[PDB]
């Protein structure tokens, strides 16, 4: 087995409720925006407003109109940040962020308009990965969950909201962090079991 550096630091999949909508976006530059508009051809913009889903309901239609400027995601110096550019809030579930501050892993954190949050730190993941090696195959295997981050636009979910799970929110995205995933593969393939 040989390795090559990921060409894309993340991939992003959009969902409405429990259904994938549109193609997966792969980020080739350090910063990108996920927004509610319609340009198909900017490698730094994942424009959700052009994505179709015939028969989507009125709640999804309404939420999509409020995504607006959306979220700016950027990766620099081993860290990933999210900035709420939308006039509505965004809601982020990142187990790496939750652990760093001592919150339950499933915590959903609101980022109000104009605010930002460090949603991932590579070094804290690398430290947790090295520590998990001493705890066994299962501990390492579960770290795939750390490499994905879910975010909803406009509508909150989780313990503070009527909406219980991310799949009840009208518009959400799932980010995969490819560097961390490859690091995990280098270890997990050597763990056995």
């Amino acid at each position: 087995v040989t390795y090559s550096e990921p060409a894309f630091w993340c991939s992003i999949a959009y969902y409405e409720l429990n259904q994938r909508v549109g193609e997966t976006f792969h980020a080739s530059q350090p910063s990108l925006t996920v927004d509610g508009f319609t340009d198909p051809s900017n490698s730094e913009r994942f424009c959700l407003g052009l994505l179709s889903n015939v028969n989507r309901n009125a709640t999804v239609e309404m939420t999509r109109r409020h995504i607006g400027r959306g979220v700016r995601l950027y990766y620099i110096g081993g860290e990933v940040f999210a900035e709420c550019l939308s006039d509505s809030a965004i809601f982020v579930q990142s187990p790496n962020c939750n652990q760093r501050y001592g919150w339950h892993p499933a915590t959903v954190c609101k980022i109000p308009p104009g605010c930002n949050l460090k949603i991932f730190n590579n070094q804290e993941f690398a430290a947790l990965l090295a520590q998990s090696v001493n705890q066994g195959f299962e501990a390492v295997y579960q770290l795939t969950r750390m490499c994905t981050i879910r975010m909803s636009f406009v509508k909150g979910w989780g313990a503070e909201y009527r909406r219980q799970t991310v799949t009840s929110t009208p518009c959400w995205i799932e980010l995969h962090l490819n560097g961390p995933l490859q690091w995990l593969d280098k270890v997990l393939t050597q763990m056995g079991s």
Binding site: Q123, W183, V187
Partner: peptide
């Protein structure tokens, strides 16, 4: 633990430290 897994994780720790100290990082 399996030594190949400890060694992989050791190199990853090194790479993660390098990411926090790029020559261009002024802060």
């Amino acid at each position: 633990p399996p030594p190949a897994a400890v060694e992989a994780a050791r190199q990853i720790l090194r790479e993660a430290q390098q990411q926090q100290h790029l020559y261009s990082d002024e802060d």
